[PDB]
Amino acid sequence: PLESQYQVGPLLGSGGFGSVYSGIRVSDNLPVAIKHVEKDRISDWGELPNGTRVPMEVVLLKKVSSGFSGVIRLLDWFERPDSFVLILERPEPVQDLFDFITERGALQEELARSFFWQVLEAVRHCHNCGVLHRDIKDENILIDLNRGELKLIDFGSGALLKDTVYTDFDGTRVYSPPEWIRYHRYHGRSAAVWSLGILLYDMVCGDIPFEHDEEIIRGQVFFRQRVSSECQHLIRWCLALRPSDRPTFEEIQNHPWMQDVLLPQETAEIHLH
Numbered sequence: 001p002l003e004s005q006y007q008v009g010p011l012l013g014s015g016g017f018g019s020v021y022s023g024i025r026v027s028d029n030l031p032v033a034i035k036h037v038e039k040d041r042i043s044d045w046g047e048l049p050n051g052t053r054v055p056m057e058v059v060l061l062k063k064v065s066s067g068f069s070g071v072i073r074l075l076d077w078f079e080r081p082d083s084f085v086l087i088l089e090r091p092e093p094v095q096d097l098f099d100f101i102t103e104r105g106a107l108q109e110e111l112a113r114s115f116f117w118q119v120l121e122a123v124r125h126c127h128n129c130g131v132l133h134r135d136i137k138d139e140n141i142l143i144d145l146n147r148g149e150l151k152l153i154d155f156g157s158g159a160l161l162k163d164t165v166y167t168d169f170d171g172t173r174v175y176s177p178p179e180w181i182r183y184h185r186y187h188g189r190s191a192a193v194w195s196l197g198i199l200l201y202d203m204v205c206g207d208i209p210f211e212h213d214e215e216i217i218r219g220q221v222f223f224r225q226r227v228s229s230e231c232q233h234l235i236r237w238c239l240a241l242r243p244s245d246r247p248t249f250e251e252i253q254n255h256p257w258m259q260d261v262l263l264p265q266e267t268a269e270i271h272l273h
């Protein structure tokens with residue numbers, strides 16, 4: 001029984017993803033998050049080896065298991081008459097990247113590098129496990145303030161990774177690629193790299209580069225903040241108009257701007273504590 005083994009706390013937020021509450025496992029006081037999703041609003045369903053129909057996020061979070069702390073952990077899930085309830089890991093103290101950027105403004109490159117690097121390791125893990133997130137953005141990134149470790153969250157718009165074209169999409173438009181905007185077609189990896197380019201720009205400039213569809217398809221990048229030449233280069237590369245012109249994950253991590261990243265704990269001590 002859900003309501004029994006978990007003590008519900010205040011509402012942390014709600015929106016397209018549903019409603020998320022703070023909570024604690026009555027068992028051992030472990031802090032958790034309780035996410036409720038209405039059955040009538042599920043964009044993509046999946047099936048487990050059982051044959052049980054469930055929200056994609058459940059299938060996806062089960063596929064990316066491992067002590068790897070770069071991806072939020074799914075502790076348990078329950079099905080209700082008209083909804084599903086997911087019990088997720090909850091770091092404390094924590095702050096999503098969006099709020100962090102909002103309060104601090106553009107991030108120093110050293111910090112942005114550490115954060116971007118951890119996001120890349122997390123995405124590579126998902127891909128290696130056959131999982132495509134499809135909604136990479138600051139709002140979907142949690143920061144474990146004490147350890148300086150980032151967690152990718154909300155795989156509700158994700159899908160199993162495939163080598164063929166995707167014609168469906170329910171992620172965030174301003175983070176979606178030109179090919180999706182113009183043709184409603186995109187491939188997994190190259191689309192992910194574009195969103196990562198949007199994310200990196202967001203980190204070093206304090207806001208996203210494109211607002212309107214016309215800007216996304218034109219892909220002309222203008223820096224409103226002082227950004228190094230090497231960082232500018234990596235960003236423009238990730239945002240290449242032609243999908244095949246974008247760097248692979250390996251190329252991104254071997255890029256000059258990505259060398260000598262700080263360790264998570266060093267990151268916390270220098271920029272978070």
Ligand SMILES: FC(F)(F)c1cccc(-c2nnc3ccc(NC4CCCCC4)nn23)c1
Nearest residue numbers: 012013017020033072088089090096153154
């Ligand atoms: F940290 C936290 F909140 F306990 C937590 C822990 C683990 C997972 C999830 C989770 N899974 N999906 C979504 C979609 C949106 C969203 N938005 C929040 C993000 C923080 C601030 C309040 C709104 N969280 N989320 C949230």
